[PDB]
């Protein structure tokens, strides 16, 4: 692809990007679906993020991790 230093094409100087036509009924329904969909996906992302954080803390300062750390320290002595 081009870089910001490459010049603009001359066959595209007068190009005007016209926006699509809108169907009011479908536009409104689709807008509400995206809100509900993204609210549910954000609720799922929050749970997955909490699981990742719970597993990291558990492996660091969990009851089974601190218990195995004391056992190894006792066996050493």
């Amino acid at each position: 692809r081009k870089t910001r230093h490459d010049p603009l094409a001359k066959s595209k100087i007068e190009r005007v990007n016209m926006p699509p036509a809108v169907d009011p009924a479908e536009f409104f329904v689709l807008m509400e679906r995206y809100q509900h969909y993204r609210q549910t996906v954000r609720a799922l992302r929050m749970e997955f993020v909490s699981e990742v954080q719970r597993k990291v803390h558990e492996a660091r300062a969990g009851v089974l991790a601190e218990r195995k750390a004391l056992k190894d320290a006792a066996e050493h002595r």
Binding site: E26, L30, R33, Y37, V41, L44, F48, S50, E51, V52
Partner: protein, 119 residues
């Protein structure tokens, strides 16, 4: 190759040969090439029906949840796969495209009947 900004994305990397597409589901930096370096492979997707008439999709759900929990984004085709699997809700455009297809075929059925009626 440290990129300026960017983020991890779960997306489809195209494999296979000419006229024989095959996708690998990978977590990779969004700035990396489509089929280049990735962080982890999270599954695969064969879009061509097999001998049993099935499209096979493998999903490493344990690792998919891990990478989403680490801040990974999802490409639109990946979101639709998870919707079809029941892991995510159906994407808003899978629902809307289905409705568009119903209206399209409702007009064709109406045109066909009007032609037979004229006959």
């Amino acid at each position: 190759k440290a990129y300026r900004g960017g983020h991890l994305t779960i997306r489809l990397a195209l494999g296979g040969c000419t006229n024989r597409p095959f996708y690998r589901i990978v977590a990779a930096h969004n700035k990396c090439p489509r089929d280049g370096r990735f962080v982890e492979q999270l599954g695969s997707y064969d879009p061509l029906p097999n001998s049993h008439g099935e499209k096979l999709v493998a999903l490493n759900l344990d690792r998919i949840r891990h990478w989403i929990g680490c801040g990974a984004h999802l490409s639109k085709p990946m979101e639709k796969l998870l919707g079809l699997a029941g892991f995510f809700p159906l994407h808003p455009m899978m629902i809307t495209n289905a409705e568009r297809l119903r209206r399209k075929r409702a007009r064709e059925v109406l045109l066909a009947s009007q032609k037979t009626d004229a006959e």
